[PDB]
Symmetry: D2
Subunit: 343 residues, 4 copies
Amino acid sequence: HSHPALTPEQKKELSDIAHRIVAPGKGILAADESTGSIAKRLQSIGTENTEENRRFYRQLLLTADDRVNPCIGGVILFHETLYQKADDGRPFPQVIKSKGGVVGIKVDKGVVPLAGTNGETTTQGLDGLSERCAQYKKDGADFAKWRCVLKIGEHTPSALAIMENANVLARYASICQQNGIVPIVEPEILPDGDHDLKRCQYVTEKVLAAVYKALSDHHIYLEGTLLKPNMVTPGHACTQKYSHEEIAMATVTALRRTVPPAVTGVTFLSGGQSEEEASINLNAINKCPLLKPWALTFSYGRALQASALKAWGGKKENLKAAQEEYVKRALANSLACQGKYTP
Amino acid sequence: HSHPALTPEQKKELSDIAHRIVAPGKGILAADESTGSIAKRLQSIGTENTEENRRFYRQLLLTADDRVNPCIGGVILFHETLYQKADDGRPFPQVIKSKGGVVGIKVDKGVVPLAGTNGETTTQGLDGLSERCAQYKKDGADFAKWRCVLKIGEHTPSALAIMENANVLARYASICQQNGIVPIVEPEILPDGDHDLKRCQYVTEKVLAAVYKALSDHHIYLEGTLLKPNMVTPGHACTQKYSHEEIAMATVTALRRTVPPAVTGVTFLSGGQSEEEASINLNAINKCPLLKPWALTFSYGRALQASALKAWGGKKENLKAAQEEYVKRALANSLACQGKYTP
Amino acid sequence: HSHPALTPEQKKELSDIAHRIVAPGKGILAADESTGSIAKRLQSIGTENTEENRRFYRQLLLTADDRVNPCIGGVILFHETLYQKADDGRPFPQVIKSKGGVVGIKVDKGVVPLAGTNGETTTQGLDGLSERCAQYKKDGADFAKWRCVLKIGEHTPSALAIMENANVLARYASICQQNGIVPIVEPEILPDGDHDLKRCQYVTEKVLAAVYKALSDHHIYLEGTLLKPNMVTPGHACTQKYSHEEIAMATVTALRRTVPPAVTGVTFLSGGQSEEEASINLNAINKCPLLKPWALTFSYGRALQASALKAWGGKKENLKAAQEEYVKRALANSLACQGKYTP
Amino acid sequence: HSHPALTPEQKKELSDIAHRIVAPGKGILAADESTGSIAKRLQSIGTENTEENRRFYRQLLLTADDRVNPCIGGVILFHETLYQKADDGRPFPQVIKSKGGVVGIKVDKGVVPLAGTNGETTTQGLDGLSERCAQYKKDGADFAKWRCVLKIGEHTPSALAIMENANVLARYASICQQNGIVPIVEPEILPDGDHDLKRCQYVTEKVLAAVYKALSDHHIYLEGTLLKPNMVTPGHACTQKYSHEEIAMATVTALRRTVPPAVTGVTFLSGGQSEEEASINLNAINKCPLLKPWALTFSYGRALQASALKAWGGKKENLKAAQEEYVKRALANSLACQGKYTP
């Protein structure tokens, strides 16, 4: 029968964190990039990838002006950054908390191939995850992030890929909630290929249906979770063109058909679209006339950080210029998630 | 990939019907009872069960005062009643339509045992259902009703019962939508046994999760469907007592965790609770402070009809007394589904 | 937990029938064709389709020489034929039983479209099936037949088609076994399209895996069932050519990977291959060096009947010529299912 | 469609290993116990648990007399033992290979709780498993072992426990076969509680059905796998008593209803029954008159090792006495897996 996964007090705690992250006007800075991931972005400057450079850049983002406090509800950190300190010696989790944000951590170990499929993958990192989550919890992290990747192709995503990725997501979410950490469920559908908007909407609805069925099977408390999907958009190679209102209608329609109202918030990923494009799409999604029972906001790594990373150019003289790039982009997305953003 | 089940115009038609049924203040009169089902209720008088008596009683309900027009959004008919005419010679579908209602039909053939379970059943009636639905559609019916029954017990509802009933519901819903008829999905959980409110909430959430996963698998258009669940209530034999706000919170919580926002409306069944109790619970559900993206209204056979059936007592002299019983109850539930009902 | 679907005596009865049908050297004559199905075959003569002609032709097949007694373990009848009598006035079930055969009946009502798929279908006929099976049981039928059809295509068979057809098969099999009738599970994969042998083997293994998972879920007693699959063969339009040993290896390999040893027998369908080709393939399957825990035999409508139907030509003078065509083909397949058939 | 998980040469390699392990008369010594697991067994002596004592004891088992060569087809090692050397300096993998055995390794990281269940667990250890398997493969291991644990209780094993454990098993098996290692699938059903033989048979059939459906979904090559189930036996606390022929009939019946013939072999676990009891049950299983398309043999940790561990008593003087205990037990089980063992 019912052997409750969570006590009422555990649920109180999870839902308080979740509402705190997505509170009106707020979104998530995704600062989580590994040393292999951030290497590409430091090469686009010519700054070499060092503990000191990575640390200084994330200090740039986290220590920025007091105007980003109402904008940023949470910050996702990579493992090593969680234990780094700013110049003044404050730990980065404390820096984030002092600005009113919630600290978050990337707990997945990356993707591995699924044999017998066409380039399909699943995500690993469940081993020892409970101990890791307990440690992260006492080191200041209140939420976690796990990335599953699905690609649209002729035979993909297959039944196996959808089933396996949904199962692993539900398993991760269960462990996180047992440790008092709000899981962010991120079933990313890559925007690669020439598929059109209808096919992305179809696949997104199938993936989300499987995800919430798996979360039901694993007894996940949905009020203590967040969703991080792709926007429904055509593939990069698609010739047909779509307005922002059509992308917004496709996105909100896909979410209304799958995501139950109990889910606290939907934090979209930018997924390889430009900064302005991301803010405009998020704005259109929040103006869509359909009823939207959850918060619709941003979780943006690159769409927040790109102009700041260019303005910085690796040289320490540019600190305030870079920080004002980032602040402008954070204010833009803060207005977009309220539907108030006009360029 | 995606081979669309429905054209955009078919979807337009289905969603227009569905919004028409559950429009604010409106609910469904369930007038559908077989000749074996209505026999019990005509014996509680002592009126014998005849085509003439059944026909006269349903004329009593359908021809009632003009005050029930804003109250009743739809009327579910049994097969033979659909082809019966009132005294003036108008067919009952025309009578219903003239009052502004939508006509509906019970398409299921009843329950059969699932071997290898403990008293669990599934519903039959899919054979030839498409032709039946086409005929009903041109005979005036715009929506259909299918009843699946699940019971709470020590090992029940089992995985097989939930899977099979969800599958048959999705199959029925697909056929109906192919024929232009809005399916009402009714996964009824019987209020039998001593189980408490928490266990009913748990089982209701599992059943609804399976139902919407099956509807996703069968490509059902959710904007063109309605849901008819039980309220979440303790079993009849449960000693523990619950307020109406606790039943309402359990019900709305169970729906927010499962039912996606695209579903047009939720029409509750009374399920063996009294007329006043049904109106009070429906009122409390509609006052619950949780956000409720769908219409929450009534589909009541017995909770609308019981006082009218007693007032009539089988004798034709009582027609207007019976009709005023029914009108009072319809006005009560119309206020309840807006949260405006105070006894 | 376990609430047994069948008593030990019911299981005894089912397994006795099942072993009786597939006993060494024996196979099934599929005489089941509707009046719309047999019309094509009576037009290929120019005999018009009448109760008298159909009845006379099936008398031709059922009354043939005493040499077909060790060859034919069972005969599948259409509904009306079950109630027809031979010239001497014996009912056809009695004629079949006197020759040592088991009587069988087609209980499915045909295929209906699955909306949202590409030309995929499911089979109907579960409504009232239990009463029909009880009646057939007391009218002499000891086994039943249900045909599910799956087609290979670019996106087919889809997950929905496989799931739905497996579910309906399991449901039918459950009802039949509750009534004391051995179900024959027939998941036919059509040999249409240009797909090669590997793809047919892949799809056949997926379909059979889903079928036996569904039969496990529905508590089917496998010792009381038979399997009627396609042989694994390339599509009709496939240019690549395959020997009989390669078709046999693909078939037996597909069955060893899916079908549990408890299944009593596998009765192959000819599926649009000629009489000689069917006997040669069945022979090669029974000579394959892989271990084969079940009986491997034939269930052939057209591969038994085609030369007899031509020899008869609709004119009553040819009775014994037609019957000797049929007898020769029955002896050929009887040797093939023992691996003893050399042309 | 079909994107083959394995080339034909990879399949050749896997099936050669699998047939080599279970070849007639041969079984598996399970020497895999962690330092926390072997501690209990070294305390039952009073030998303290040290690298030297563990190493010496496993040398005792692996270096035993030449009579155990036809008895032992494989040896499962714990991680550290794989890198240990015998007295003469030969690595243990080489010692095992020289005696004609196949080397195997335990790749699972243990069980973790499933939240929302009643004491149910799943197994972890998939993270980085592919690299570990590649390393083990070049360090001499040809097969792997993964232990999933299910317990019988009033509501257990639940749907979630069966689904999750089957999924993880299929995932492990896929990774192993990609690396050229034969996975042994071990869904252990604990013999705890008062449940009788029928209930264990029911649960075992459900678990194995789910396991092989998952292995089909993940494209596992069954000819390159082995199965390691429990024998079907009553719970430890069950008062009803059963003969060995009834346990054997229940076991073989459960396997015939689930395990497809392609599976190369079934290596039973002793699971807390004595040495003699294990040999007698294995003997009865191999004499059961039902047809058995797979090899039925032993994989025994404790039922091979208990008398040797007592005879050794931790003191080096007893080496040959202990080794002759182990040799006698290995000869007994070698006769049992051929049905030739009479005490």
